[PDB]
Amino acid sequence: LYFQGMTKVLFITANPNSAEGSFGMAVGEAFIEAYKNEHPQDEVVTIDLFNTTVPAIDADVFAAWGKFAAGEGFEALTEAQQQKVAAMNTNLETFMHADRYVFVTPMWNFSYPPVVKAYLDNLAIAGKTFKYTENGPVGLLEGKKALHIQATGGVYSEGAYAAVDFGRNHLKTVLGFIGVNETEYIAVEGMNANPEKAQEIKEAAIANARELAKRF
Amino acid sequence: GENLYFQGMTKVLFITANPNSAEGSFGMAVGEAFIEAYKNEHPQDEVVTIDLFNTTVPAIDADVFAAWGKFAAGEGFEALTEAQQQKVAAMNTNLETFMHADRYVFVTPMWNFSYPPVVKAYLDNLAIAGKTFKYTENGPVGLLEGKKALHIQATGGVYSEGAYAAVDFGRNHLKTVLGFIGVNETEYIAVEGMNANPEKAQEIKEAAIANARELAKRF
Numbered sequence: 001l002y003f004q005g006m007t008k009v010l011f012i013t014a015n016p017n018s019a020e021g022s023f024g025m026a027v028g029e030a031f032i033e034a035y036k037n038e039h040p041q042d043e044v045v046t047i048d049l050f051n052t053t054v055p056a057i058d059a060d061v062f063a064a065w066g067k068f069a070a071g072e073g074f075e076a077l078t079e080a081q082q083q084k085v086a087a088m089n090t091n092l093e094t095f096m097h098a099d100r101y102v103f104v105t106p107m108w109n110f111s112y113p114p115v116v117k118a119y120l121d122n123l124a125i126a127g128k129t130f131k132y133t134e135n136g137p138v139g140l141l142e143g144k145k146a147l148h149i150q151a152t153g154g155v156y157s158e159g160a161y162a163a164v165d166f167g168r169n170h171l172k173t174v175l176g177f178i179g180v181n182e183t184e185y186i187a188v189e190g191m192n193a194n195p196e197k198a199q200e201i202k203e204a205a206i207a208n209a210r211e212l213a214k215r216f
Numbered sequence: 217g218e219n220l221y222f223q224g225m226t227k228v229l230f231i232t233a234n235p236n237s238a239e240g241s242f243g244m245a246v247g248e249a250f251i252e253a254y255k256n257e258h259p260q261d262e263v264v265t266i267d268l269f270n271t272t273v274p275a276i277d278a279d280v281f282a283a284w285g286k287f288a289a290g291e292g293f294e295a296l297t298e299a300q301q302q303k304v305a306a307m308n309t310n311l312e313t314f315m316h317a318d319r320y321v322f323v324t325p326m327w328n329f330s331y332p333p334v335v336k337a338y339l340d341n342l343a344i345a346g347k348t349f350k351y352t353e354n355g356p357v358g359l360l361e362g363k364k365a366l367h368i369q370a371t372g373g374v375y376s377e378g379a380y381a382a383v384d385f386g387r388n389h390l391k392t393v394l395g396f397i398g399v400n401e402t403e404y405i406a407v408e409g410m411n412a413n414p415e416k417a418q419e420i421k422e423a424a425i426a427n428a429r430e431l432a433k434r435f
């Protein structure tokens with residue numbers, strides 16, 4: 001074809017179990033298939049954070065960032081610093097070039113798996129996703145939309161317990177800091193607080209995901 | 217005055233989550249000052265340092281779920297694979313090292329409104345059912361008793377009061393998990409405002425260091 005432009009969607013998952021053993025992954029796959037049937041041509045790339053190199057910010061990264069500030073190039077870094085920065089570049093560039101993001105995270109001790117924090121630490125880079133201005137920082141990503149699907153044993157979406165929903169709230173905060181302010185949230189909650197009605201909660205969340213896909 | 221349970225040496229855990237040292241980190245410089253002041257008040261208390269950037273902190277992954285599945289089935293430690301045995305043992309080491317301690321000190325910087333990811337993996341190594349918490353008919357309840365925790369955080373801006381405290385996710389999430397495992401009292405020291413006010417960087421650091429020395433006399 002003469003034109004190669006298309007909407008790029010990133011299906012970012014952070015759950016070790018598959019869709020058959022995870023409520024979050026089950027609703028995540030239902031939203032993706034419903035989005036594909038509504039949006040052909042659009043590309044959907046899956047990113048499993050448990051099988052993706054996500055370097056944590058450590059002494060090598062600070063040392064690598066320091067040499068970059070001193071005007072030095074990539075060759076000045078050690079081999080260990082080179083492999084970490086390159087993997088951080090790939091994660092950042094792939095996220096910046098996409099248009100739609102879909103996060104699937106389970107709640108482990110009031111927050112997400114730790115690899116989600118390292119992944120966000122790979123995305124928040126000054127000069128790339130946000131810039132400093134006279135009136136504080138400003139996110140750089142424009143024309144982006146994000147969906148977060150979180151599965152929790154208890155119920156956190158409504159009530160006072162939304163204050164301890166740290167995984168959901170911190171993800172929304174970082175997304176807005178890099179310019180992704182148009183977000184959507186689908187809660188898959190209560191399958192373990194009341195196991196007798198866990199399948200109804202899953203089925204209701206699937207219907208909630210299939211409706212959002214036609215307008216997302 | 218005593219004559220109850222012998223001496224009972226107080227174990228203190230100085231848990232750091234910053235790759236830089238005290239010379240290149242405000243939170244570490246305040247954390248090191250608190251320890252030096254605590255050791256002078258209690259010369260016989262044991263202080264064990266745990267650097268999370270140089271400690272095996274296994275993340276909950278596919279091997280951990282497969283291990284917990286075989287443990288719940290009735291099998292023992294002889295059924296796991298070599299990758300599962302190494303991960304489960306290192307989680308028990310971090311768990312029992314934390315449980316056997318009476319005092320806890322955390323030093324973290326704010327990286328994008330939260331802590332480094334290794335802190336979350338370390339907290340997931342501690343919240344274990346039947347060990348640090350259990351579920352009752354009235355709800356979950358922690359099991360650790362007689363513990364006192366202190367969190368030192370260094371942030372560029374100010375997140376102590378107002379609507380900016382709601383986005384201090386690193387401090388708040390650490391308090392919730394510590395309170396979930398029984399440690400209901402976690403004092404907090406803020407080294408904040410160095411990047412918002414670069415001219416007050418040394419004034420804020422020096423004031424927070426003196427605050428940590430005064431707190432070390434009663435902690």
Ligand SMILES: Cc1cc2nc3c(=O)[nH]c(=O)nc-3n(C[C@H](O)[C@H](O)[C@H](O)COP(=O)(O)O)c2cc1C
Nearest residue numbers: 021022023024105106107108109110151152153154
């Ligand atoms: C290590 C661990 C920690 C958990 N912590 C919480 C929690 O803090 N609050 C909660 O409601 N459920 C908690 N759960 C239960 C999960 O939220 C529940 O399994 C949910 O369905 C997410 O699983 P899934 O995304 O794989 O479907 C925890 C489960 C595990 C294994």
Ligand SMILES: Cc1cc2nc3c(=O)[nH]c(=O)nc-3n(C[C@H](O)[C@H](O)[C@H](O)COP(=O)(O)O)c2cc1C
Nearest residue numbers: 240241242243244325326327328329370371372373
């Ligand atoms: C990767 C990174 C992310 C940061 N994110 C924030 C932030 O979200 N809010 C803030 O006030 N400061 C932020 N800072 C600045 C540090 O929190 C601040 O300089 C703090 O003093 C660093 O802690 P330390 O000196 O003890 O290492 C960030 C710094 C880095 C390197």
Ligand SMILES: CN(C)c1ccc(C(=C2C=CC(=[N+](C)C)C=C2)c2ccccc2)cc1
Nearest residue numbers: 109110153154155156161192193355356396
């Ligand atoms: C069986 N039942 C009625 C329940 C037992 C426990 C829980 C909860 C919970 C909190 C923290 C957890 N963590 C940290 C593992 C796990 C569960 C819980 C979740 C949200 C609000 C209040 C409590 C909900 C229902």
